Amino acid sequence: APDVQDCPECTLQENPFFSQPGAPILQCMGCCFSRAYPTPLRSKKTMLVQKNVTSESTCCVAKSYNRVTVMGGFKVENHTACHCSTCYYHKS
Numbered sequence: 001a002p003d004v005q006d007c008p009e010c011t012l013q014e015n016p017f018f019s020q021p022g023a024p025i026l027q028c029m030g031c032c033f034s035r036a037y038p039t040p041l042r043s044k045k046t047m048l049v050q051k052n053v054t055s056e057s058t059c060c061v062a063k064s065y066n067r068v069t070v071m072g073g074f075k076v077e078n079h080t081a082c083h084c085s086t087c088y089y090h091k092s
């Protein structure tokens with residue numbers, strides 16, 4: 001691709017704190033790319049209807065965690081797995 005749209009590939013960003021010769025904690029951080037597709041609808045009311053987002057801020061709430069609460073009681077849910085989308089409350 002031309003570039004990276006200033007966004008990496010959603011995943012774990014190994015804890016730059018807990019990372020030690022035997023324990024490289026994490027913290028899912030990145031971008032899960034985007035999947036948009038324009039479609040010529042009808043739009044009842046004004047030119048547009050209701051509010052809609054471009055959809056890109058995908059959430060990969062670690063599918064699985066190995067949580068290793070660090071400094072200030074951090075929580076890297078020592079991510080063992082990360083799955084974009086599916087959050088505790090989408091649309092916000």
Ligand SMILES: *[C@@H]1O[C@H](CO)[C@@H](O)[C@H](O)[C@H]1NC(C)=O
Pocket residue numbers: 022023024025026066068078079080
């Ligand atoms: C965190 O999870 C990764 C992947 O399973 C593992 O390699 C690492 O040892 C874990 N870190 C700790 C402190 O358990």
Ligand SMILES: *[C@@H]1O[C@H](CO)[C@@H](O)[C@H](O)[C@H]1NC(C)=O
Pocket residue numbers: 037038039047048049052053
């Ligand atoms: C979002 O709303 C705008 C309103 O103008 C519309 O043009 C666009 O097609 C909508 N996007 C999607 C994915 O429906």
